[PDB]
PDB file of C-alpha atoms (C1' of nucleotides) and ligand atoms in Angstrom:
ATOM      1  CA  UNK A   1       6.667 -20.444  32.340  1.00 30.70           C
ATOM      2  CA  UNK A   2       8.857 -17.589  31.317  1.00 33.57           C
ATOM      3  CA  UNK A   3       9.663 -15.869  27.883  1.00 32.55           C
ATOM      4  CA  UNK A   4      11.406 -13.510  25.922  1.00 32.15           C
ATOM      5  CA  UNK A   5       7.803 -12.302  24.712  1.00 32.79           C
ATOM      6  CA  UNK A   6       5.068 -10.653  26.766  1.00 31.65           C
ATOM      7  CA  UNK A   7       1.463 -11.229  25.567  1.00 33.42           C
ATOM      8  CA  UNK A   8      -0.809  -8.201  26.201  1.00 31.79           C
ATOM      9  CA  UNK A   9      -4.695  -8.436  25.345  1.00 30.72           C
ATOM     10  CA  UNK A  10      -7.670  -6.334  26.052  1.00 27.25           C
ATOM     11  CA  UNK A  11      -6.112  -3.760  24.689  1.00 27.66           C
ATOM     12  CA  UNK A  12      -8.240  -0.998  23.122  1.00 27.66           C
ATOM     13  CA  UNK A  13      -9.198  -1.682  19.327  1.00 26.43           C
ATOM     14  CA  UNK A  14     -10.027   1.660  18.432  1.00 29.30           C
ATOM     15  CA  UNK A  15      -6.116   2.943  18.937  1.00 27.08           C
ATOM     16  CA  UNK A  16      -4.830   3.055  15.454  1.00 28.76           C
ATOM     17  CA  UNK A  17      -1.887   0.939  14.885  1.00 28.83           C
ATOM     18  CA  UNK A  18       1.089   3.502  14.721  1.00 27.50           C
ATOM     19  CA  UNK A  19       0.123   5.275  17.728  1.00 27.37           C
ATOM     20  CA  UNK A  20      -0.295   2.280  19.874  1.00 23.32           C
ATOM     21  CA  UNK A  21       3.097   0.757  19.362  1.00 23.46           C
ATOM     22  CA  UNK A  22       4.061   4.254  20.135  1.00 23.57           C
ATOM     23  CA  UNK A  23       2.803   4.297  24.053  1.00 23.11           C
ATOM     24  CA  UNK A  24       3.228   0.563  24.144  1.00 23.06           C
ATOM     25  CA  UNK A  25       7.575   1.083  23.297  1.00 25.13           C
ATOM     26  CA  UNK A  26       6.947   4.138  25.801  1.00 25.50           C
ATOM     27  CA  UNK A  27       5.516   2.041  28.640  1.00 22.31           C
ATOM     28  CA  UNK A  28       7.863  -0.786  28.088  1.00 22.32           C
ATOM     29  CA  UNK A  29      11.004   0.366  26.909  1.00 24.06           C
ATOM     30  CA  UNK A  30      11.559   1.498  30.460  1.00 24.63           C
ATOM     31  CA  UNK A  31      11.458  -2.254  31.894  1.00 28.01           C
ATOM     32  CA  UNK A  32      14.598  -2.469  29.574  1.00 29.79           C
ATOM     33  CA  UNK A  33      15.660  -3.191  26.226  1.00 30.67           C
ATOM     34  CA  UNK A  34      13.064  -4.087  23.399  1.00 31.21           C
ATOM     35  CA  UNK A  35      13.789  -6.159  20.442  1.00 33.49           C
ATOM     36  CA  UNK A  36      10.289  -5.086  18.945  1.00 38.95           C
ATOM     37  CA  UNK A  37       6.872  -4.820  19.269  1.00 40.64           C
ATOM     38  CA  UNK A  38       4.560  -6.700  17.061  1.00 42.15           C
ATOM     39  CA  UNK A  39       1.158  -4.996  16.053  1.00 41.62           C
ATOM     40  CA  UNK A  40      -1.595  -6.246  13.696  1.00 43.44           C
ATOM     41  CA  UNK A  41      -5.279  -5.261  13.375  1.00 46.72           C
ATOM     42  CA  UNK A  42      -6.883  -8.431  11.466  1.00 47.93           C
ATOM     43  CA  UNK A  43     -10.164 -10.546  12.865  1.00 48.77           C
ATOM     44  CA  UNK A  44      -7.499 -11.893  15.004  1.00 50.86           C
ATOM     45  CA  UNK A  45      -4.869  -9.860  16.289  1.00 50.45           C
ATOM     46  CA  UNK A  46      -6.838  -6.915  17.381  1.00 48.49           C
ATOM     47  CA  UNK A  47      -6.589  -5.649  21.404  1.00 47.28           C
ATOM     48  CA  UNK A  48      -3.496  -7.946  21.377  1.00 45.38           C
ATOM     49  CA  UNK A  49       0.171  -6.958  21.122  1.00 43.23           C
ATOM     50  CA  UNK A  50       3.515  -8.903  21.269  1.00 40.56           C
ATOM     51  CA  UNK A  51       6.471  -7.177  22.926  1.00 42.55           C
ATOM     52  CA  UNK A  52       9.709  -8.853  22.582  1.00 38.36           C
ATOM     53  CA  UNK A  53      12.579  -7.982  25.763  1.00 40.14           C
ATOM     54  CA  UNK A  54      16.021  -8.482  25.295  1.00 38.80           C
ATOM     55  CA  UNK A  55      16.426 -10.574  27.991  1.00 38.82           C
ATOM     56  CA  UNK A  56      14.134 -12.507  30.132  1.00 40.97           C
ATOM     57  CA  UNK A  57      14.226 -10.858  33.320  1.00 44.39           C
ATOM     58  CA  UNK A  58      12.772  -7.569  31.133  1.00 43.93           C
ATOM     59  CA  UNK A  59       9.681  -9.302  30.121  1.00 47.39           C
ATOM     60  CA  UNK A  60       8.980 -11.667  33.762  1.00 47.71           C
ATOM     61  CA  UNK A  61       9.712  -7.719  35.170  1.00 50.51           C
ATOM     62  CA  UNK A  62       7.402  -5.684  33.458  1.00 50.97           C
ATOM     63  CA  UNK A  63       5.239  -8.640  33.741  1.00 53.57           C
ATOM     64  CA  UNK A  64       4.607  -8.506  37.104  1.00 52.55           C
ATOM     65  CA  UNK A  65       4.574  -4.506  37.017  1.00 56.10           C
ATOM     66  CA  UNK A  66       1.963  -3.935  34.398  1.00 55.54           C
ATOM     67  CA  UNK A  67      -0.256  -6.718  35.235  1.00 56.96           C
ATOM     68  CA  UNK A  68      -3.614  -4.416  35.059  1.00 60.01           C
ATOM     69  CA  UNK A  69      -2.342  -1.215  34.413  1.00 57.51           C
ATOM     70  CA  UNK A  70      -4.822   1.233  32.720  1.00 55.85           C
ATOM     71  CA  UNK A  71      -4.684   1.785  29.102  1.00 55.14           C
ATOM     72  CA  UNK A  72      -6.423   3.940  27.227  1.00 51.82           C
ATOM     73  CA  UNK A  73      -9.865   3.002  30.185  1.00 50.07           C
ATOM     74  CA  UNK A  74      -8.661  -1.187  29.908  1.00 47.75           C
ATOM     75  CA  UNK A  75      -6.750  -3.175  32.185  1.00 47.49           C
ATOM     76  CA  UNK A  76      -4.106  -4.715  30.843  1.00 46.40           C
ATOM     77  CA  UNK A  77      -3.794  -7.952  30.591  1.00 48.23           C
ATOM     78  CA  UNK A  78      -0.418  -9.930  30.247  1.00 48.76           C
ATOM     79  CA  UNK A  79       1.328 -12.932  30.707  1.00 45.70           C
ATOM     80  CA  UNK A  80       4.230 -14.982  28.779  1.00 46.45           C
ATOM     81  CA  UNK A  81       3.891 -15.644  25.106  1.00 47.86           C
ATOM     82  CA  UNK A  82       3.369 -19.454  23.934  1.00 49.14           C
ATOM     83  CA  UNK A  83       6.297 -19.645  22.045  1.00 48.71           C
ATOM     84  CA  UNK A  84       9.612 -17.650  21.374  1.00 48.29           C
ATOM     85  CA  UNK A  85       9.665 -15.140  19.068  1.00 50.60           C
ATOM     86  CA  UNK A  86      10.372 -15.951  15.644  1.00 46.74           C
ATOM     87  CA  UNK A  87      13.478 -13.718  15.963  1.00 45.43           C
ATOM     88  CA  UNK A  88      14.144 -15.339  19.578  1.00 47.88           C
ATOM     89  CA  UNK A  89      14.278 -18.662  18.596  1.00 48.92           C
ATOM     90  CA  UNK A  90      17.161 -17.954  15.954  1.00 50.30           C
ATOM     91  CA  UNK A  91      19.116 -16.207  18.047  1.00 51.05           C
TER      92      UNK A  91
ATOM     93  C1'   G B   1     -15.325  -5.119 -12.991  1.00 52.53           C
ATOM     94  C1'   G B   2     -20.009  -3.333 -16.567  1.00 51.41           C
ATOM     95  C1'   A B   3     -21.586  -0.959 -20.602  1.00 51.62           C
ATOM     96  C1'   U B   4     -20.666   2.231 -25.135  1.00 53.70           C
ATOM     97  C1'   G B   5     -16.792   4.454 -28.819  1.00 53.41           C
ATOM     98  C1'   G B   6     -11.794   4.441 -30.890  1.00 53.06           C
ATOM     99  C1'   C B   7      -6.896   1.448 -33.488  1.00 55.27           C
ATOM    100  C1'   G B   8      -6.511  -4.449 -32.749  1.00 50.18           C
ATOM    101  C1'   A B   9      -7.698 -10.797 -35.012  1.00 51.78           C
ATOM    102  C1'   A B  10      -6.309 -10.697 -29.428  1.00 50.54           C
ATOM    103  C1'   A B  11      -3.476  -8.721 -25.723  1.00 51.46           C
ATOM    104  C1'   G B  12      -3.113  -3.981 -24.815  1.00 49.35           C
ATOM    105  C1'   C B  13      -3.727   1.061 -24.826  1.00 45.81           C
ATOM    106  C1'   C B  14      -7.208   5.836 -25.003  1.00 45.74           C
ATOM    107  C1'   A B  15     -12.102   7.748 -24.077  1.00 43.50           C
ATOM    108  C1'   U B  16     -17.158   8.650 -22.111  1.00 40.68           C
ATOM    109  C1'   U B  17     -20.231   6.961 -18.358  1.00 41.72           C
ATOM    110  C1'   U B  18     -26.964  10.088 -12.894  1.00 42.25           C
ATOM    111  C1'   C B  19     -23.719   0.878 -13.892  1.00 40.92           C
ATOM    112  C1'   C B  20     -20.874  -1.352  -9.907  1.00 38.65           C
ATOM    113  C1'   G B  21     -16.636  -0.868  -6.928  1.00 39.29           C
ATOM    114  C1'   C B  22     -11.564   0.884  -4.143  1.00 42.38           C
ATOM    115  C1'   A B  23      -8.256   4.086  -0.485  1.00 38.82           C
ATOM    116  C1'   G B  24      -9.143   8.772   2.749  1.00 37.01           C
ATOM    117  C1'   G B  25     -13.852  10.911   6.432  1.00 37.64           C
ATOM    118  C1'   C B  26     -17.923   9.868   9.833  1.00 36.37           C
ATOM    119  C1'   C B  27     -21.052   6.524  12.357  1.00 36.13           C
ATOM    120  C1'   C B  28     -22.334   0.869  12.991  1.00 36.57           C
ATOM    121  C1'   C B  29     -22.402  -4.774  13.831  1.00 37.87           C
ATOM    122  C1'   A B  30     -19.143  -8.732  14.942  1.00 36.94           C
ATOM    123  C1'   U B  31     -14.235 -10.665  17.566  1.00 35.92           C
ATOM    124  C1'   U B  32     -11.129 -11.204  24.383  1.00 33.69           C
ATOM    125  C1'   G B  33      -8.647 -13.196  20.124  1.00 31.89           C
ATOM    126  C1'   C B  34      -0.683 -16.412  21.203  1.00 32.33           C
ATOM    127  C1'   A B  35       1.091 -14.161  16.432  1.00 33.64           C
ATOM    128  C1'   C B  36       5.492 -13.103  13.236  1.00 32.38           C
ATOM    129  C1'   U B  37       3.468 -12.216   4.077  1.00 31.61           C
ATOM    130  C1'   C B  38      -1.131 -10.129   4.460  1.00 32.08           C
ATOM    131  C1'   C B  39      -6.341 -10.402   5.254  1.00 30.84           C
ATOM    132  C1'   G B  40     -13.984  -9.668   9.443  1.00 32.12           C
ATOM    133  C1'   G B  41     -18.327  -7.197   7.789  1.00 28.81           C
ATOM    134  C1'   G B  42     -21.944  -2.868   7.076  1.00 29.11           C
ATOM    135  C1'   G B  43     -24.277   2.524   6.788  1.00 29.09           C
ATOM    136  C1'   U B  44     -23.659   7.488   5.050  1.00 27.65           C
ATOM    137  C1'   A B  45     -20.211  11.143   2.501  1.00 24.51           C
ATOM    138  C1'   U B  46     -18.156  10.199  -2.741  1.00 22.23           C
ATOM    139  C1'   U B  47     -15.436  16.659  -5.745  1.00 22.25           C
ATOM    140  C1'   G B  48     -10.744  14.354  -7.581  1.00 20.71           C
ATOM    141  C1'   G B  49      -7.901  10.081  -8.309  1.00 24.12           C
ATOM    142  C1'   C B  50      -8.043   4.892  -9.458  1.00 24.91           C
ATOM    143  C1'   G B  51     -10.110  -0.654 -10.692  1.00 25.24           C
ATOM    144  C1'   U B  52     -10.274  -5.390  -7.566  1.00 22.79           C
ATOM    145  C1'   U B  53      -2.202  -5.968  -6.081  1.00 20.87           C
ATOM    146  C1'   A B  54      -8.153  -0.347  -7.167  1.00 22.51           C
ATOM    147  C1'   G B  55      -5.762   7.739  -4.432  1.00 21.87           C
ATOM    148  C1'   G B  56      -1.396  11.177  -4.103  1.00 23.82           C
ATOM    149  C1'   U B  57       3.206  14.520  -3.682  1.00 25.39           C
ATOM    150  C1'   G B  58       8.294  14.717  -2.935  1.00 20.32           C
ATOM    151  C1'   G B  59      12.430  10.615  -1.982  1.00 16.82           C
ATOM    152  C1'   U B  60      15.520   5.226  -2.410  1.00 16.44           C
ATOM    153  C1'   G B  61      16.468   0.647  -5.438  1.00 18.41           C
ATOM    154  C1'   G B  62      14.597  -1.987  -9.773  1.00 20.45           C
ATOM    155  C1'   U B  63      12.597  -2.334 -15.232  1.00 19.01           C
ATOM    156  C1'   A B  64      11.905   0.485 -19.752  1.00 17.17           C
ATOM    157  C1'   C B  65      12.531   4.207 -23.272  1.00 15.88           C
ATOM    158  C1'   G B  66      14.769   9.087 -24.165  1.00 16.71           C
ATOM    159  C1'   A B  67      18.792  12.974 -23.781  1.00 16.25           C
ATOM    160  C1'   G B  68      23.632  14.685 -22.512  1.00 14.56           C
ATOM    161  C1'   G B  69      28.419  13.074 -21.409  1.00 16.07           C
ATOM    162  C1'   U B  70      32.350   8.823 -22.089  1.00 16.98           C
ATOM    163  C1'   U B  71      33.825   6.897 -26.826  1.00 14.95           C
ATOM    164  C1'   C B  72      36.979   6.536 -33.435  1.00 13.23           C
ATOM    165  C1'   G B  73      31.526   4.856 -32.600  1.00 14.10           C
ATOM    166  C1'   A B  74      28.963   2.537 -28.865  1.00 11.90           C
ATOM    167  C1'   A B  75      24.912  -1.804 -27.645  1.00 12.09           C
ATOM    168  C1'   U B  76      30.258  -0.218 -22.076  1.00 13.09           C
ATOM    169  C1'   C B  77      30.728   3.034 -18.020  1.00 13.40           C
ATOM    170  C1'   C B  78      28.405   8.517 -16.181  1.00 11.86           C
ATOM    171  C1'   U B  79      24.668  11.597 -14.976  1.00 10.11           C
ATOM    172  C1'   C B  80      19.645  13.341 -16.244  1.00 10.29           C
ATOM    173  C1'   G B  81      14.470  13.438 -17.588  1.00 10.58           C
ATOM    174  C1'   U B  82      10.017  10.243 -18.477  1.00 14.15           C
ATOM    175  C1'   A B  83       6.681   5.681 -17.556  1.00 11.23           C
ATOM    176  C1'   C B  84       5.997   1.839 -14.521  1.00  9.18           C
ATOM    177  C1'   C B  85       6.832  -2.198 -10.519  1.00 10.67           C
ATOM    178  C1'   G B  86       8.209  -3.438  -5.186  1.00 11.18           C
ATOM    179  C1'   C B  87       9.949   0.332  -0.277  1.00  7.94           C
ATOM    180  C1'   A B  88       9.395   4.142   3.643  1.00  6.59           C
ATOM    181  C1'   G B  89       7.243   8.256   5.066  1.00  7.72           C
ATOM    182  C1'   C B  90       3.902  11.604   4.663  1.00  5.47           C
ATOM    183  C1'   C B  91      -0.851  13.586   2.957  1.00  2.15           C
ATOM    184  C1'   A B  92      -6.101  12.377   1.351  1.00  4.81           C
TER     185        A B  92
HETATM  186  K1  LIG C   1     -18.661   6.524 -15.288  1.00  3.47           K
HETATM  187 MG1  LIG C   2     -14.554  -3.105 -19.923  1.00  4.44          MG
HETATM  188 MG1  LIG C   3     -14.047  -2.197 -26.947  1.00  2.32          MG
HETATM  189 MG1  LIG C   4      -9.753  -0.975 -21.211  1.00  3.34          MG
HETATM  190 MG1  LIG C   5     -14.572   4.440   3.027  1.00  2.00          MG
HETATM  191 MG1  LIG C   6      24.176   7.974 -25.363  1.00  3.36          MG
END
RNA sequence: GGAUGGCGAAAGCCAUUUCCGCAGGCCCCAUUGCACUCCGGGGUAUUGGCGUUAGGUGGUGGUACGAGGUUCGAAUCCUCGUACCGCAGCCA
């Protein structure tokens, strides 16, 4: 079920932090607007990213775009978030 | 952190240190993991800096003391230097 937040895993853990929010904005951006991009590299958060669209149809988009796309020699994987987006919800 | 020396009852502050450790470098093991304050672990390198909230320059706000101005005089308001705490970046 959709969401205003893509979750990508399988992402490569040895891009540092900075420069993978970098390509990630880069990549994304272009399926429209981004709130933000959420990046963390504890035990648990590593080779996963949360991308937060504007507007729903951004993130079910680039969803179905991405889906596999090569990154850095992995295969992204994405689908919806769980829940909305601390800012999201809010709003 | 330790240990030793200095002023102290202490706290604290200074110092030395082929005791241990931290951030930067380089290799390594572990994790496929739905979060929104952060946060796995190890080897070697280890001059300098620092001490578990653990490196730095220049910059923004704070806190402190100092100086210049304001002022009859200021404890007010102004700007400035210095120390330190949280910020961002950048560098190690
Ligand atoms: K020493
Ligand atoms: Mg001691
Ligand atoms: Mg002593
Ligand atoms: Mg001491
Ligand atoms: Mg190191
Ligand atoms: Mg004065």
């Amino acid at each position: 079920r959709p969401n205003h937040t893509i979750y990508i895993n399988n992402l490569n853990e040895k891009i540092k932090k900075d420069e993978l929010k970098k390509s990630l904005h880069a990549i994304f951006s272009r399926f429209g607007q981004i709130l933000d991009i959420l990046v963390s590299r504890s035990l648990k958060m590593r080779g996963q990213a949360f991308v937060i669209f504007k507007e729903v149809s951004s993130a079910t988009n680039a969803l179905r775009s991405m889906q596999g796309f090569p990154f850095y020699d992995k295969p992204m994987r994405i689908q919806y978030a769980k829940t909305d987006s601390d800012i999201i919800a809010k709003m």
